């Protein structure tokens, strides 16, 4: 259909502080959640059945990411570390030390041999997953790094920052290929590549989402209507039904846009605080949405389209 009809299926509770992110396992069976409560909780994507807690970080966690094979997780913490976890045993495999301030964002490359991290120390770091050692430190930005993402073949890294810049990096050399957004500001609160790796989705703290052509360096689409002036809110490409942009908002709603028409096609109501994080299931029309400390719940939504 030409509009989704996402409806609340489950409300997942357990976190005792603000939830920071939610990500579906690539294999679709797990939802992972991180929180300011220093915990990672694993949930069944289809029944929301609480699976396990993963503990070890000494301070709050801002991001969590899956390896390609759904077996490993990596988390970014205010304790200035990342931890690589084995999901099955729930054990810390490695602790990545090097950042001199909070680690805000992380992702595996598709090969899942590397992890990219963004920090308040204004650097992007590339880590070897096998040895937990830092391979490279990029003096990426002049303010905290809000987001990092590898493209589909893992040859580029896109990073965003409160310095109002979005930069793309050559993984192998760590040299800057392009400075996509060269504004004094507003703060770039989030960036990721599109699934084909042609486009960058970029959020700015003037309630604006923009789809960029990486090669051309030009803004293709603008999405508006939501509120985003304070928080680094994740945005997603929904690709299992109709082609949507998904994002949280500071008005406690999940916003869904038609990618092409830039039209608002649904607003999800239920959260009682800022929706900080959203995730689109890899195979089913299901959304995970996560909220800050007044709510602390994860909501699973299902659509027919
Ligand atoms: C400005 O600080 C926050 O927004 N705190 C909320 C928790 C962190 C949410 C987040 N972590 C990573 C991203 C985007 O890469 N967004």
UniProtKB/Swiss-Prot annotation:
<dbReference type="GO" id="GO:0072686">
    <property type="term" value="C:mitotic spindle"/>
</dbReference>
<dbReference type="GO" id="GO:0044545">
    <property type="term" value="C:NSL complex"/>
</dbReference>
<dbReference type="GO" id="GO:0045722">
    <property type="term" value="P:positive regulation of gluconeogenesis"/>
</dbReference>
<feature type="repeat" description="WD 6">
    <location>
        <begin position="227"/>
        <end position="267"/>
    </location>
</feature>
<dbReference type="GO" id="GO:0005634">
    <property type="term" value="C:nucleus"/>
</dbReference>
<comment type="subunit">
    <text>Interacts with PAXBP1; the interaction is direct and links a WDR5-containing histone methyltransferase complex to PAX7 and PAX3. Interacts with HCFC1. Component of the ATAC complex, a complex with histone acetyltransferase activity on histones H3 and H4. Component of the SET1 complex, at least composed of the catalytic subunit (SETD1A or SETD1B), WDR5, WDR82, RBBP5, ASH2L/ASH2, CXXC1/CFP1, HCFC1 and DPY30. Core component of several methyltransferase-containing complexes including MLL1/MLL, MLL2/3 (also named ASCOM complex) and MLL4/WBP7.</text>
</comment>
<comment type="similarity">
    <text>Belongs to the WD repeat WDR5/wds family.</text>
</comment>
<keyword id="KW-0007">Acetylation</keyword>
<feature type="site" description="Important for interaction with histone H3">
    <location>
        <position position="293"/>
    </location>
</feature>
<feature type="repeat" description="WD 3">
    <location>
        <begin position="99"/>
        <end position="139"/>
    </location>
</feature>
<dbReference type="GO" id="GO:0051302">
    <property type="term" value="P:regulation of cell division"/>
</dbReference>
<dbReference type="GO" id="GO:0042393">
    <property type="term" value="F:histone binding"/>
</dbReference>
<keyword id="KW-0832">Ubl conjugation</keyword>
<feature type="modified residue" description="N6-acetyllysine">
    <location>
        <position position="83"/>
    </location>
</feature>
<feature type="cross-link" description="Glycyl lysine isopeptide (Lys-Gly) (interchain with G-Cter in SUMO2)">
    <location>
        <position position="17"/>
    </location>
</feature>
<dbReference type="GO" id="GO:0000123">
    <property type="term" value="C:histone acetyltransferase complex"/>
</dbReference>
<dbReference type="GO" id="GO:0006094">
    <property type="term" value="P:gluconeogenesis"/>
</dbReference>
<dbReference type="GO" id="GO:0044666">
    <property type="term" value="C:MLL3/4 complex"/>
</dbReference>
<dbReference type="GO" id="GO:0045815">
    <property type="term" value="P:transcription initiation-coupled chromatin remodeling"/>
</dbReference>
<dbReference type="Pfam" id="PF25175">
    <property type="entry name" value="Beta-prop_WDR5"/>
</dbReference>
<dbReference type="InterPro" id="IPR001680">
    <property type="entry name" value="WD40_rpt"/>
</dbReference>
<dbReference type="InterPro" id="IPR020472">
    <property type="entry name" value="G-protein_beta_WD-40_rep"/>
</dbReference>
<dbReference type="InterPro" id="IPR036322">
    <property type="entry name" value="WD40_repeat_dom_sf"/>
</dbReference>
<dbReference type="GO" id="GO:0006355">
    <property type="term" value="P:regulation of DNA-templated transcription"/>
</dbReference>
<dbReference type="InterPro" id="IPR015943">
    <property type="entry name" value="WD40/YVTN_repeat-like_dom_sf"/>
</dbReference>
<keyword id="KW-0156">Chromatin regulator</keyword>
<keyword id="KW-0805">Transcription regulation</keyword>
<dbReference type="GO" id="GO:0140004">
    <property type="term" value="F:histone H3Q5ser reader activity"/>
</dbReference>
<feature type="site" description="Important for interaction with histone H3">
    <location>
        <position position="104"/>
    </location>
</feature>
<dbReference type="GO" id="GO:0071339">
    <property type="term" value="C:MLL1 complex"/>
</dbReference>
<feature type="repeat" description="WD 7">
    <location>
        <begin position="270"/>
        <end position="304"/>
    </location>
</feature>
<dbReference type="InterPro" id="IPR019775">
    <property type="entry name" value="WD40_repeat_CS"/>
</dbReference>
<dbReference type="GO" id="GO:0045995">
    <property type="term" value="P:regulation of embryonic development"/>
</dbReference>
<dbReference type="GO" id="GO:0045893">
    <property type="term" value="P:positive regulation of DNA-templated transcription"/>
</dbReference>
<dbReference type="GO" id="GO:0140109">
    <property type="term" value="F:histone H3K4me1 reader activity"/>
</dbReference>
<feature type="site" description="Important for interaction with histone H3">
    <location>
        <position position="234"/>
    </location>
</feature>
<comment type="subunit">
    <text>(Microbial infection) Interacts with herpes virus 8/HHV-8 protein LANA1; this interaction regulates the MLL1 histone methyltransferase activity on viral DNA.</text>
</comment>
<feature type="site" description="Important for interaction with histone H3">
    <location>
        <position position="78"/>
    </location>
</feature>
<dbReference type="GO" id="GO:0005654">
    <property type="term" value="C:nucleoplasm"/>
</dbReference>
<feature type="repeat" description="WD 2">
    <location>
        <begin position="56"/>
        <end position="97"/>
    </location>
</feature>
<dbReference type="GO" id="GO:0035097">
    <property type="term" value="C:histone methyltransferase complex"/>
</dbReference>
<keyword id="KW-0804">Transcription</keyword>
């Amino acid at each position: 259909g030409s509009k989704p009809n996402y409806a609340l299926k489950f409300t997942l509770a357990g976190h005792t502080k603000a939830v920071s992110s939610v990500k579906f396992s690539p294999n679709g069976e797990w939802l992972a959640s991180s929180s300011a409560d220093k915990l990672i909780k694993i949930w069944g994507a289809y029944d929301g059945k609480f699976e396990k807690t993963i503990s070890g970080h000494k301070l709050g966690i801002s991001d969590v990411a899956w390896s390609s094979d759904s077996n490993l997780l990596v988390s970014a913490s205010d304790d200035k570390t990342l931890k690589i976890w084995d999901v099955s045993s729930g054990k810390c495999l490695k602790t990545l030390k090097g950042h001199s301030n909070y680690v805000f964002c992380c992702n595996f490359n598709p090969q899942s041999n590397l992890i990219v991290s963004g920090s308040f120390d204004e650097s992007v770091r590339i880590w070897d997953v096998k040895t937990g050692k830092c391979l490279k430190t990029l003096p990426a930005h002049s303010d905290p790094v809000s987001a990092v993402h590898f493209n589909r073949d893992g040859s580029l890294i896109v990073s965003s920052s409160y310095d109002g810049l979005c930069r793309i990096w050559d993984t192998a050399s760590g040299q800057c290929l392009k400075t996509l957004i060269d504004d004094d500001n507003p703060p770039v609160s989030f960036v990721k590549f599109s699934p084909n790796g042609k486009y960058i989705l970029a959020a700015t703290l003037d309630n604006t989402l923009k789809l960029w052509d990486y090669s051309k360096g030009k803004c293709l689409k603008t999405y508006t209507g939501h509120k985003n002036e304070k928080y680094c809110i994740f945005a997603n490409f929904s690709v299992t039904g109709g082609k949507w942009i998904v994002s949280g908002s500071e008005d406690n709603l999940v916003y869904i846009w038609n990618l092409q028409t830039k039209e608002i096609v649904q607003k999800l109501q239920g959260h009682t605080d800022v929706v900080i994080s959203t995730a689109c299931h890899p195979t089913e029309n299901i959304i995970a949405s996560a909220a800050l400390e007044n709510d602390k719940t994860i909501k699973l939504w299902k659509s027919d389209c």
